[PDB]
């Protein structure tokens, strides 16, 4: 595993901290843990102190008159790391320890307590034309030497972290929220009674919100449209505590609910940011420094306990409204963000916008029970965002391992990643039957995703694809792959090929949530891809075809959010574009 | 009534030096408005462009006038010239108070109550209360355009312009309607802008001191600075259309209060010093809202983080 | 002498109408130049830009000569008025047409002789040309101005704007000053420019015509549109600057060519529609030097050399 | 030795020329010969038509209106390849045999022939802003694909190879130039005798003129100010036969001469580009594209047989005029252009706006009879633009091979060098005695100049740098190169360093004709270099000295036209920055 590191204009100065991500309960957050390095030649009599900076900007730029920030403090906690004053002497976490294993004495230790209630880091969207800074809340640990508090921060002599606070949701499920409010007309004979409904009250980015309405029409009056609006009840209370709200997921039917008839409907609404990319004020979860991330996750305030929390609280709700032909509405509540994810997310658009692998011989030559470390030359830093695929010949790929990290669930234990430098490896011990099958070393950080060059052992719910049948030298060809479990907002379907009897390649890619397309330079604008949430689609549109573009197609999945490898592979098709 | 011998000829000169002043420096403003068009700054340069607007269009019928007083109160130039310099000179009053009022609620909306200046649209907005402003303010200054004509009494047989509210019912109402048109005018464009704006920079002055409370001993002196630059804005505003709208309204209360004619004679008197006052706004404006926003001076004048291991 | 009863009725709706036409067509040109202007970083723009000034403030003082044949030849506004008036009419009459000259002395340089024209500074040079063109037009113009004024009871009180050439010289001079003005004016703002004109473009249809031999089909057409334009542009100008000046020549040399008196009342009555027609080129002048010019309609809306191996 | 490639976006119409610019000496020029690959089927039966486009644009821009394009051909012949004509006959030059000889047949040749009289390739200055396309006179060979000239030509199948004409110098001298003109003055009785001359009637680009200015004064009436202008006679005889002119050096003296005097003093007056970059208008000598060329080479007429030559002449004079207090001037004509040289020159800058090489051998025993493969790897393609130096003990560097092939004069035979790829190779066959030094390789193609590891075997005019003495351990120190021996715009000169016992390492450089400068990342803005030319002297101010600054500082020049590597070095300065 590694750890992250930010250096300082100096570069003496070098900070190391844990997971950049922080997790806040209901109760208590994960405290910050964290060291620095110190010359004490340079530091002949400074001190070097790192706070936490968590403050919240609530105006556009700075400076508008020339002498306005505004940027609020919610909370510093400051600490000198040199030489650390014997009056907290909290025990080192063993990440600590494990940093001055790597580094030394020199690297001085630091660990930060928050308090229980403080706003979630959530960022509000500057819109189509705003660049600037975001309005919203930040967390940022930094830490300057100086040899008093009161001294002018240093161009040179300070170092910049900006560190997230997400909530994820609670293990525990919640009550599904119900609604209920009844409303007469000029016709009263039996007020109209409002019975809409949510599945579940905690939801992840992307699922599709099943919004279950039913009413009884027993009124006369007729209602034209109905109209489904999951809000995001932006509180932003900063000074003037307001509720500024903004739709993000919207939906107008047409179901005409004619009187003394009993409507009953499930709409599937997904709050993604693309649809909504341009409403300016929408709150989006933690931003590193400028990258695209989901809507804000939804906030776990201590029940009963609403201390007025300054800065953005972030809930989301169903709006239900029922339009009189000549306005009956309700609200839902409802908690949208993620689930606890074991690798610490990456906080960047994970194929972020070339590198090529040189896997081991295809002749590594092993019996049964001859263990074999399996190993791959990689062109440049994947940072440990690798995965190796059990490509069994004439069947689909299988995903062995994410990240060169613990393996993906159900691997059993034989194989084994380890990287190292720019270049990767994955041992195995026995080789069981199942393990005479070709082997690949695979990285998703750069797009393309790039594979390795494959190895053969030599011992001595469902992806339904459309299309086929070798065809069109230089038409066009439409393959639809359709995926019957995974939500399209919920994951990004790739599309890969293998050149005939060659090893794998990427294609084209899809990120739904974001709504935003990716192609190789094979291909290029060539090549198109789209996916529609009708029945779980996606199609591939490849055009001016050729002899090159004979290969076996493969579509597959990856989670949406936390792009992790790929771990589901389509049935494949062997199309040797012909006549 | 006994005009002042002193007035007709102090009168003309006072109006040349505002007709240079205001004009140049208008000029300047616009000039710097127009070299600039970066599309870049100032969210809101529209309400300072059309206050340099209505301002420069405001001093540049001033000669006109100016030849009045110097003509012993005899208009040469014709009815039409008569009627468009008065509905200019009233239009781009009401505009300018409109402008500075506008000015002070985007200031007060982009300040005290950021999070609302930063969500909506701003650009769009601004542009629409423009045009409805500008829209309103030639709706109101309309009347003293189908109202105004020129030629009255006297062997002198001197063209005076002035406005003969005798078109309606002249005998049916005469001092109904002067008065009647005078309060709208003077409650329409100055009494309701100017508690707006006013009521917007106590606000202001408020959360500038708020923000301001400890900073640092930079900031409060910053904060005394920013005090100072609200104060003076107000404070210019207030001396300027005090007198004009101060005289103004007493002499339309005379008509029902049996002012001391007499004393009636000084308000006759007085109210062109009044309105120059009212004008000397006009012509110190670009020399702060221009001057004190560095832009129109401007206009004129890292390391990054890495990952390593882990090793348990 | 008698006016045509025809011409009093006739000849405003022609002004009004030229006025609307010419006016709209200015601003739209104004505004495409405005809303690039600056950034493509044309050379000969700023003639155009000046063509479209001069164009639209000949038009803009025109309704008060409208109102002035409506109201049988009563210039109701001041001696002021009539003096700017007609110093602004003739300031862009000689504007107009040296800027006319000036567009095709640059393309005949950027045409006939494009080496200078890469040679030279086009912007240093253009501008400079810009400026003295619009002083020399000023000064042409400032006899006018000196020389216009107003009055003439004439026993009916219709008070009349004119040229007083009375004014300075004496009595002594009463036609030689009118025939030394009208002459200078006409050879020093018609005379020149247009044979700078005319014999520019004379040069320009030449070198394309022999530019253009070469190719086939397309490349002909080409070449005869191009012709076609140039004659489009310069019989555009003589249609309408031939009546003006040649009645006013002809009138002037009436003086001593003792005409039959009645083609001179003909020629009296004539004149003005003369004037209308000599405002045909500035109302025509966007729809077709801003038409022409893609530049306005836009407005409006590999391999690589490599290296290898001899093997000997 | 390599040769020119070029080819259509197909990537099957490839151009192959021997060498791009051409000598058109009197009596002719050199035939055009080139070789283009085909294919009959993508020519199905199309024939790649290739023709020497000597063209003439005279109008800035490239569309100033509709359907006037300001260009005329000059000249133009066309070829028909494949099958080859049957009537040409025409024996192929050894190039394109060779050409054959690795690649196919289907490299169908042509051969072109340009008259006696044309103009050489010259294009005008364009300006400080000018944009568009420079206006001038330009040769590109075109090879377009169609059934028939007429039919309509496509822009993939179409390549335009921009080729050069230039003259160089004539290989004897001439006749120098005179000037006698006499004006009379109040004592007419012995009027002003003029005899101001030059040194030589030929110069290349750089070479100081010493205009000798002799002139007897006895008239009472003085001259204030004295004008040497070296000025462009533009011959422009396109449509009208204009003469522009434009001083590209104008030296001005106060030599207030006075009567009874007789000022013979020479004038040094170097022409170059830098303090001429904005004289719209100036002809300099064809660019490919866009490279920043030296000025207009003289073009040599035949005895003034001028067949009105539509094109841009160039003639290059010398004024001198002395200017009454109360104007006499004369002319001088020179003709300016580079001397014949070996290596066909390199129409770029040569070293254009990272490279980094590896040596083997280090160390590697060697006594007589065994020859040295002192090969080197390169990180990217240099060209062929490495040059090999040895180190011969406590010496400084010495240039052994230039071009990567080539061999400087004076140095013996046993060197020997050889191109391979991104990698070179230098051997010496019989090792003479004083083989006992250790090597490096300087590639010259991208700053910084990047050279060899150094490879010391196993045996079991003047230059001076002053301002030597360890001092100023963080302050700035000022070096002084005094090159005599060679014109600062004649050469531009380069500061190095080699490390302790370690190899080589460039630092800044200077190219004074051109008059700018680069320098190395590892001192960045911290070095200052420049060239003054009184004293012929380079100052190389390193400031904020660093115990990093602990080097050997070496000094070399290079000719400043078509940059070879290095073939002077001087004699060094160990500089241990400190106290
Ligand atoms: C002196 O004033 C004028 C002189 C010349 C032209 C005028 O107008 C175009 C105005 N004038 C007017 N005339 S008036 O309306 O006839 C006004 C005279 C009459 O009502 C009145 N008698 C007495 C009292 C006490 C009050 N009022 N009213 N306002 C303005 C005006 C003009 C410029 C700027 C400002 C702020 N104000
Ligand atoms: C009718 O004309 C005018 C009417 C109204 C105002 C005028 O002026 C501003 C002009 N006018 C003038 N007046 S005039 O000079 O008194 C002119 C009337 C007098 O001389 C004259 N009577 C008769 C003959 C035969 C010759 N000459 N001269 N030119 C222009 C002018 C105006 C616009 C456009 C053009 C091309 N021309
Ligand atoms: C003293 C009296 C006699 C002068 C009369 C002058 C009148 C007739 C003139 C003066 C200026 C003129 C106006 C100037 C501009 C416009 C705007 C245009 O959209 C319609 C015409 C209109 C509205 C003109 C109509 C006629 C007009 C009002
Ligand atoms: C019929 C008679 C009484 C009308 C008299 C009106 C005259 C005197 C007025 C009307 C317009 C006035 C001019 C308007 C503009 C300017 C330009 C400025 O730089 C100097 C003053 C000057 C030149 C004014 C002087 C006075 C002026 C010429």
């Known amino acids: 595993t590694r750890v992250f590191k930010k250096a300082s204009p100096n570069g003496k100065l070098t900070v190391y901290l844990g997971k950049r991500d922080f997790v806040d309960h209901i109760d208590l957050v994960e405290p910050v843990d964290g060291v620095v390095l110190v010359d004490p030649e340079y530091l002949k009599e400074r001190r070097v102190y790192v706070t936490l900076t968590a403050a919240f900007r609530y105006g556009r730029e700075d400076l508008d008159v020339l002498g306005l920030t505004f940027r609020k403090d919610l909370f510093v906690a400051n600490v000198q790391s040199f030489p650390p004053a014997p009056e907290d002497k909290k025990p080192l976490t063993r990440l600590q320890e494990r940093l001055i294993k790597k580094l030394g004495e020199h690297a001085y230790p630091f660990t930060f307590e928050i308090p229980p209630n403080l706003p979630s880091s959530v960022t509000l969207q500057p819109g189509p034309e705003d660049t600037g800074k975001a309005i919203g809340v930040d967390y940022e640990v930094k830490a300057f030497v100086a040899e008093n508090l009161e001294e002018k921060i240093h161009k040179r002599n300070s170092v910049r972290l900006v560190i997230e606070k997400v909530q994820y949701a609670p293990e525990r499920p919640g009550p599904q929220p119900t609604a209920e409010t009844t409303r007469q007309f000029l016709m009263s004979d039996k007020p109209l009674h409002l019975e809409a409904s949510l599945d579940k009250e905690i939801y992840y980015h992307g699922e599709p919100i099943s919004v279950n309405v039913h009413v009884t029409n027993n009124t006369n009056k007729t209602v034209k449209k109905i109209k489904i609006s999951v809000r995001q009840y932006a509180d932003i209370v900063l000074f003037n505590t307001a509720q500024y709200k903004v739709p993000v997921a919207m939906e107008e039917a047409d179901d005409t609910v004619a009187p003394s008839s009993t409507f009953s409907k499930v709409y599937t609404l997904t709050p993604f940011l693309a649809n909504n990319r341009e409403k300016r004020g929408l709150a989006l979860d933690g931003k590193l420094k400028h990258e695209d991330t989901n809507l804000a996750s939804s906030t776990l305030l201590r029940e009963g306990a609403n201390r007025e929390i300054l800065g953005i609280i972030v809930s989301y709700k169903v709006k239900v409204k029922l339009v009189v032909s000549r306005d009956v509405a309700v609200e839902l509540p409802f908690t949208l963000m993620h689930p606890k994810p074991k690798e610490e997310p990456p906080h960047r658009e994970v194929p972020e916008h070339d590198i090529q692998m040189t896997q081991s011989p295809s002749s590594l030559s092993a019996s049964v029970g001859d263990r074999v470390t399996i190993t791959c030359r990689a062109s440049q830093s994947v940072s440990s965002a690798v995965a190796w695929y059990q490509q069994k010949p004439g069947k689909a790929p299988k995903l062995?391992?994410?990240?060169?990290?613990?393996?993906?669930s159900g691997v059993p234990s034989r194989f084994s990643g380890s990287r190292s430098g720019t270049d990767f490896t994955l041992t195995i011990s026995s080789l069981q039957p199942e393990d005479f099958a070709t082997?690949?070393?695979?990285?998703?950080?750069?797009?393309?995703?790039?594979?390795?060059?494959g190895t053969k052992v030599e011992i001595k719910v469902q992806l339904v694809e459309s299309g086929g049948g070798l065809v069109q030298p230089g038409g066009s060809l439409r393959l639809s792959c359709?995926?019957?479990?995974?939500?399209?907002?919920?994951?990004?379907?790739?599309?890969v090929r293998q050149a005939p009897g060659k090893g794998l390649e990427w294609?084209?890619?899809?990120?739904?949530?974001?709504?935003?397309?990716?192609?190789?330079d094979s291909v290029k604008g060539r090549f198109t891809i789209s996916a529609d949430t009708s029945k779980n689609t996606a199609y591939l549109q490849m055009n001016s075809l050729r002899a090159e573009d004979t290969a076996v197609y493969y579509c597959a999945r990856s989670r949406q959010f936390w792009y992790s490898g790929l771990d589901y592979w389509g049935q494949g098709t062997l199309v040797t574009v012909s006549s | 009534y006994t005009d002042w011998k002193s007035s007709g000829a102090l009168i003309p000169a006072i109006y040349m030096l505002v007709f240079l002043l205001g004009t140049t420096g208008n000029g300047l403003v616009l000039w710097t408005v127009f070299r600039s068009s970066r599309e870049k700054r100032r969210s809101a340069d529209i309400f300072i462009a059309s206050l340099a607007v209505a301002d420069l269009t405001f001093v540049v019928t001033l000669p006109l006038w100016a030849t009045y007083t110097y003509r012993d109160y005899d208009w040469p130039f014709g009815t039409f010239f008569c009627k468009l310099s008065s509905y200019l000179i009233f239009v781009n009053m009401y505009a300018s108070v409109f402008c500075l009022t506008g000015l002070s609620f985007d200031r007060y909306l982009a300040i005290v109550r950021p999070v609302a200046n930063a969500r909506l649209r701003l650009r769009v907005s601004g542009a629409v209360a423009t045009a409805v402003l500008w829209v309103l303010a030639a709706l109101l200054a309309m009347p003293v355009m189908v109202l105004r004509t020129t030629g009255d009494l006297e062997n002198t047989t001197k063209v005076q312009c002035y406005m003969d509210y005798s078109m309606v019912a002249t005998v049916s109402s005469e001092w109904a309607w002067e008065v009647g048109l005078g309060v709208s005018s003077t409650t329409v464009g100055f009494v309701v802008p100017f508690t707006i704006m006013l009521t917007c920079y106590f606000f202001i002055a408020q959360t500038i001191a708020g923000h301001f409370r400890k900073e640092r001993i930079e900031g409060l002196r910053k904060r005394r600075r920013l005090l100072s630059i609200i104060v003076v804005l107000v404070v210019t505003f207030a001396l300027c259309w005090m007198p004009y709208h101060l005289v103004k309204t007493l002499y339309m209360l005379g008509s029902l209060l049996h002012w001391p004619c007499d004393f009636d004679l000084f308000l006759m008197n007085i109210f062109p010093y009044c309105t120059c006052i009212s004008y000397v706004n006009s012509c110190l404006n670009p020399f702060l809202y221009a001057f004190f926003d560095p832009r129109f001076r401007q206009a004129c004048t890292s390391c990054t983080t890495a990952s390593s291991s882990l090793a348990k | 002498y008698t006016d045509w009863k025809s011409s009093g009725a006739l000849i405003p709706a022609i002004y009004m109408l030229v006025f609307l036409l010419g006016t709209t067509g200015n601003g739209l040109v104004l505004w495409t130049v405005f809303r690039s202007s600056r950034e493509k970083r044309r050379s000969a723009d700023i003639f155009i830009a000046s063509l479209a000034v001069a164009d639209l403030t000949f038009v803009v003082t025109l309704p008060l000569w409208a109102t002035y044949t409506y109201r049988d030849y009563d210039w109701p506004f001041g001696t002021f008025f009539c003096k700017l008036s007609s110093y602004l009419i003739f300031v862009n009459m000689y504007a107009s047409v040296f800027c006319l000259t000036g567009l095709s002395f640059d393309r005949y340089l950027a045409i006939v002789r494009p080496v200078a024209n890469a040679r030279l500074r086009l912007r240093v040079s253009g501008a400079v040309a810009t400026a003295v063109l619009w002083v020399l037009a000023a000064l042409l113009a400032m006899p006018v101005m000196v020389l216009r004024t107003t009055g003439d009871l004439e026993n009916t009180t219709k008070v009349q704007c004119y040229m007083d050439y009375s004014m300075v010289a004496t009595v002594s001079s009463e036609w030689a000053w009118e025939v030394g003005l009208g002459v200078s004016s006409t050879t020093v703002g018609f005379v020149v420019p247009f044979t700078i004109m005319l014999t520019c473009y004379f040069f320009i249809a030449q070198t394309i015509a022999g530019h253009f031999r070469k190719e086939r089909i397309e490349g002909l057409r080409k070449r005869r549109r191009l012709l076609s334009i140039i004659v489009v542009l310069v019989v555009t100008f003589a249609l309408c600057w031939m009546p003006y000046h040649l009645v006013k020549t002809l009138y002037m040399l009436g003086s001593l060519l003792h005409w039959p008196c009645d083609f001179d009342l003909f020629l009296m009555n004539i004149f003005p529609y003369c004037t209308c027609i000599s405002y045909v080129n500035s109302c025509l002048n966007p729809f077709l030097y801003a038409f022409f010019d893609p530049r306005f309609r836009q407005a409006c809306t590999s391999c690589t050399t490599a290296s290898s191996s001899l093997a000997k | 030795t390599r040769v020119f490639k070029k080819a259509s976006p197909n990537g099957k119409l490839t151009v192959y020329l021997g060498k791009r610019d051409f000598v058109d000496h009197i009596d002719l020029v050199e035939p055009v010969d080139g070789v283009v690959l085909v294919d009959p089927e993508y020519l199905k039966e199309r024939r790649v038509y290739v023709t020497l486009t000597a063209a003439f644009r005279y109008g800035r821009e490239d569309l100033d209106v509709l359907g006037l394009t300001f260009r005329k051909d000059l000249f133009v012949a066309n070829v028909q390849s494949f099958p080859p004509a049957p009537e040409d006959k025409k024996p192929l030059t050894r190039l394109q045999e060779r050409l054959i000889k690795k690649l196919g047949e289907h490299a169908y040749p042509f051969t072109f022939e340009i008259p006696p009289n044309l103009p050489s390739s010259v294009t005008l200055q364009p300006g400080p802003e000018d944009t568009g396309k420079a206006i001038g006179v330009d040769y590109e060979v075109k090879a377009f694909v169609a059934e028939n000239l007429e039919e309509k030509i496509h822009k993939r199948n179409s390549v335009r190879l921009v080729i050069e004409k230039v003259q160089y110098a004539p290989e004897r001298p001439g006749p120098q130039p005179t000037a006698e003109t006499t004006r009379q003055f109040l004592m007419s009785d012995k009027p002003l005798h003029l005899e101001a001359s030059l040194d030589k009637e030929i110069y290349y680009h750089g070479e100081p003129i010493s205009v000798n200015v002799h002139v007897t004064n006895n008239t009472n009436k003085t001259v204030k100010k004295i004008k040497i202008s070296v000025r462009q006679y533009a011959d422009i005889v396109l449509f009208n036969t204009a003469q522009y002119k434009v001083p590209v050096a104008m030296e001005e003296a106060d030599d207030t001469v006075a009567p009874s005097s007789t000022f013979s003093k020479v004038y040094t007056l170097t022409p170059f580009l830098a303090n001429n970059r904005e004289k719209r208008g100036l002809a300099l000598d064809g660019k490919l594209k866009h490279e920043d060329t030296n000025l207009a080479s003289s073009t040599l007429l035949r005895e003034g047989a001028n067949r009105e030559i539509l094109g841009i002449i160039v003639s290059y004079k010398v004024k001198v005029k002395l200017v009454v207090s109360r104007d006499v001037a004369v002319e001088l004509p020179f003709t300016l252009m580079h001397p014949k040289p070996k290596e066909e020159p390199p129409h770029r800058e040569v070293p254009e706006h990272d490279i980094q090489m590896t040596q083997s051998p280090s160390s590697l025993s060697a006594s007589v009879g065994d020859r040295v493969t002192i090969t080197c790897r390169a990180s990217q393609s240099v060209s062929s633009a490495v040059a090999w130096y040895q180190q011969k003990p406590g010496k400084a560097p010495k240039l052994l091979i230039y071009?990567?092939?080539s061999l400087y004069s004076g140095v013996p035979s046993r060197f020997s060098g050889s191109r391979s790829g991104t990698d070179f190779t230098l051997t010496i066959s019989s090792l003479q005695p004083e083989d006992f030094a250790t090597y490096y390789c300087?590639?010259?193609?991208?700053?910084?100049?990047?050279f060899g590891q150094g490879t010391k075997v196993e045996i079991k005019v003047q230059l001076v740098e002053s301002g030597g003495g360890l001092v100023q351990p963080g302050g700035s120190l000022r070096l002084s190169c005094a090159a005599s021996?060679?014109?600062?715009?004649?050469?531009?000169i380069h500061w190095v360093r080699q490390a302790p016992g370690k190899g080589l390492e460039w630092v800044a450089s200077?190219?004074?004709?051109?008059?700018?400068?680069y320098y190395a990342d590892s001192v960045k803005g911290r070095f200052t270099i420049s060239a003054d030319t009184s004293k012929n002297t380079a100052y190389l101010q390193m400031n904020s000295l660093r115990a990093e600054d602990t080097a050997v500082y070496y000094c070399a020049r290079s000719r400043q036209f078509w940059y070879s590597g290095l073939d002077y070095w001087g004699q060094g300065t160990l500089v241990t920055v400190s106290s």
């Open positions: 071009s990567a092939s």
């Open positions: 021996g060679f014109n600062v715009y004649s050469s531009s």
């Open positions: 300087q590639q010259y193609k991208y700053v910084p100049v990047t």
């Open positions: 200077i190219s004074s004709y051109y008059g700018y400068t």
